[PDB]
Design a protein around this ligand. Structure first.
Ligand SMILES: OC[C@H]1O[C@H](OC[C@H]2O[C@H](O)[C@H](O)[C@@H](O)[C@@H]2O)[C@H](O)[C@@H](O)[C@H]1O
Ligand SMILES: OC[C@H]1O[C@H](OC[C@H]2O[C@H](O)[C@H](O)[C@@H](O)[C@@H]2O)[C@H](O)[C@@H](O)[C@H]1O
Ligand SMILES: OC[C@H]1O[C@H](OC[C@H]2O[C@H](O)[C@H](O)[C@@H](O)[C@@H]2O)[C@H](O)[C@@H](O)[C@H]1O
Ligand SMILES: OC[C@H]1O[C@H](OC[C@H]2O[C@H](O)[C@H](O)[C@@H](O)[C@@H]2O)[C@H](O)[C@@H](O)[C@H]1O
Ligand SMILES: [Ca+2]
Ligand SMILES: [Ca+2]
Ligand SMILES: [Ca+2]
Ligand SMILES: [Ca+2]
Lengths: 156, 156, 156, 156
């Protein structure tokens, strides 16, 4: 069990939340950056971010979260698409996460990404893609998932 | 912080979840009883339950949970109505919770309950009632909120 | 990461505490039974217990907890010996835990148990045994480790 | 309930630990600074510290932690004294904590501080002082209490 604030839901030491208002990629990432981590004495230490995903288990959890929350929107295509923190740059091999973590799990639907350069990843929860990732235009207005600053203690 | 399993959300030492399929009151309560608490050695110790509410703060939290999860269904009326564990019996003063806890908070919209005997409580999230409670027929098919067995350590 | 009450320390979903006063096996188990688990509505659901151990990792954690708490008592022999919930009955193969969990990890020092029938398990933290288990007389007065009722949520 | 790493014990959203080796004030703080907080992607965000205390309840908890851990050392005087992060500067009114939090709770034994300038705080657990603070030389070798970086999420 992970501990998270009210309205947020934990998996594997991370806290997530899906937001229902539609934002483009930059505004969405900005929205997530309004959530933070701070020392008890006042200093802001880190910021939130669109979600990153590092295992098939994280991916299945996020997929279920989208499907359970948006049950009447599930189509037979790709929709609903929901923003995560993935950025495809000048070539398909340039992949990064907004939280700056490493790209060590390939969750793309086969064929994807194919809308480069400078496209954005989204969870595509329609029956065609089953939650695995599509790349889209940053200017699309979509729902999105935030993560809280991911952190652990170090002992040494 | 409260620690809850994935998909569940904690407030004040309790873990809740909103389910989106429509069930009548008895089937809903049944669905919540599929979730339990167990010793690590295997004995089942308690069962889940439609949510109970013991303070204005619990009530505001559950309201926000319904409004954020179901933003497109919010009407100017009572709808969406969502089941909680409240039972009105033979008279209005016979009020009980399915988890067996005490009725020490009155969250009723004024004029409610008015559909007795043997009516059922629901959160009425439309703009008319703001999440405060209506009473209804047990045979209505609604979405519902489950709580996991509420539990604390005793230390002496 | 595990949440425990003050003075108690968590590992892997369980909460443990070492007590410094010396008690025979029965009184010690009794002492741990003063700690409990309870519904928020009043019913007592389970009781504490001398620690059980189900993996090499639980074992190393308990060993470290003893060594770091009693640093001046560590001898080059078996001492200090500290009670856990292990019971050897009429034969060496009759091994049980007081919390009723399964004996699925062999933490015995080679040669142990050898003081049957009806002997008791103890962590032997002297340099000879490195925290691995000796069996002793139930009438020995030792320090001991309690665990709080171990519990998880069930989802199905 | 607070979640802490193994061997550490939580109170009120903070994790603490008592160490049994004697160090002077600077070496003690240094030892606590070996424990940190870090982003999952690698950046070190904060460091540990000698404990700070901000309420009568924090103070009773730390007192109980010292008394339960060191039961044979309790004298009828001040001993055992145990370092916390309190610094008294050039005057008695110059009081600071090493974690940089605010001095908003007075836990001094009456008469203290009286060994300034540049003295240091310690919990004095003997029967004379009951855990409340004495000020001492920085060059005394004592046991000490560390706190892990105290942090919370900001919902802004
Ligand atoms: O992000 C989803 C998706 O967007 C583009 O969609 C192709 C699909 O949409 C069409 O309108 C048509 O109705 C579908 O049959 C077709 O599969 C894009 O080409 C995909 O790469 C993907 O990004
Ligand atoms: O369950 C909701 C609600 O049902 C009944 O509604 C009275 C209300 O609905 C009318 O159709 C009208 O449009 C509304 O203005 C009026 O408030 C029942 O009377 C309530 O107790 C409550 O159960
Ligand atoms: O409980 C510890 C231990 O007690 C018995 O001790 C055997 C050991 O102690 C002897 O005095 C000798 O000095 C040691 O070298 C020897 O190992 C018992 O035999 C063990 O099974 C165990 O219970
Ligand atoms: O650090 C503890 C304490 O040290 C000084 O002790 C005064 C106390 O010790 C005396 O030897 C005498 O035995 C006690 O009765 C007396 O209380 C100092 O004066 C204190 O401020 C404090 O630092
Ligand atoms: Ca695409
Ligand atoms: Ca009604
Ligand atoms: Ca033996
Ligand atoms: Ca002094």
């Amino acid at each position: 069990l992970t501990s998270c604030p009210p309205l947020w839901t934990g998996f594997n030491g991370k806290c997530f939340r899906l937001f229902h208002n539609h934002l483009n990629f930059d505004n969405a990432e900005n929205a997530c950056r309004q959530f933070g981590l701070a020392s008890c004495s006042g200093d802001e230490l880190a910021t939130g971010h669109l979600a990153s995903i590092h295992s098939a288990e994280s991916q299945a959890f996020l997929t279920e979260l989208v499907k359970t929350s948006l049950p009447d929107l599930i189509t037979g295509g790709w929709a609903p698409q929901v923003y995560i923190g993935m950025k495809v740059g000048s070539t398909n091999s340039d992949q990064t996460w907004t939280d700056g973590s490493s790209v060590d799990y390939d969750g793309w639907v086969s064929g994807e990404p194919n809308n480069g350069p400078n496209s954005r990843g989204a969870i595509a929860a329609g029956d065609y893609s089953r939650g695995f990732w599509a790349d889209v235009y940053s200017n699309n207005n979509f729902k999105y998932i935030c993560q809280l600053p991911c952190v652990h203690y170090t002992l040494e």
